[PDB]
């Protein structure tokens, strides 16, 4: 009926199956965690600034954003409103990302973000 039908073949989909992310704790500011690509639409029309979209996240975590590098290439950037601390406890969170083109294409995916403990500098507060 529909499930048997290859619905994916006759529709546009993102390049690089989603989705994983991993950075060395919150040590690097504004450093991309992972990059994802989108298949070129037949229309190939340009998209407005702020490529769609972050719909949800697994709490408690605030330090991520979407960076549209160009055309159909983008990556998630770390260190936003607040920084992430390993000592807090949580090390992984899933981000529900919604993707929409100008033509009206749609796709929802989950992006896991991992936090890795980073060693403090040899010099610092005594
Ligand atoms: Ca740590
Ligand atoms: Ca630390
Ligand atoms: Ca450490």
């Amino acid at each position: 009926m529909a499930s048997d039908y290859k619905d994916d073949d006759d529709k546009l989909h993102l390049i690089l199956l989603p989705a994983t992310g991993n950075v060395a704790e919150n040590s690097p500011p504004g450093t991309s965690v992972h990059k994802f690509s989108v298949k070129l639409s037949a229309s190939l029309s340009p998209v407005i600034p702020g490529f769609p979209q972050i719909v949800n996240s697994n709490p408690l975590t605030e330090a991520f954003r979407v960076n549209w590098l160009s055309g159909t290439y983008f990556e998630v950037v770390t260190t936003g409103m607040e920084q992430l601390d390993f000592e807090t406890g949580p090390n992984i969170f899933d981000l529900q990302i919604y993707v929409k083109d100008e033509v009206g294409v749609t796709d929802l995916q989950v992006l896991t973000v991992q936090v890795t403990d980073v060693n403090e500098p040899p010099g610092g507060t005594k």
Side-chain angles (χ1 to χ4, degrees), residues 17-107:
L17 298 169
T20 60
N22 193 38
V23 293
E25 241 201 81
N26 64 301
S27 175
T31 302
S32 297
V33 182
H34 196 88
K35 181 200 290 182
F36 297 93
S37 297
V38 183
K39 285 182 75 65
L40 59 103
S41 178
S43 294
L44 202 72
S45 293
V47 298
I48 72 300
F51 187 85
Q53 182 180 58
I54 301 168
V55 182
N56 216 337
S57 68
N58 182 338
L60 289 167
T61 180
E62 186 178 59
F64 56 86
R65 67 187 181 85
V66 180
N67 187 326
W68 183 61
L69 289 168
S70 179
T72 56
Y73 297 91
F74 63 91
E75 58 192 354
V76 180
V77 181
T78 185
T79 314
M81 291 174 71
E82 291 172 339
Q83 292 172 330
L84 301 171
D85 300 313
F86 186 81
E87 290 78 18
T88 300
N91 67 339
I92 62 168
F93 57 91
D94 304 270
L95 291 165
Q96 280 89 331
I97 300 168
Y98 180 81
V99 180
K100 187 177 75 67
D101 200 42
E102 291 299 310
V103 297
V105 176
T106 179
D107 191 334

Side-chain angles (χ1 to χ4, degrees), residues 25 87 117-120:
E25 241 201 81
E87 290 78 18
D117 189 342
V118 64
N119 295 323
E120 293 178 353

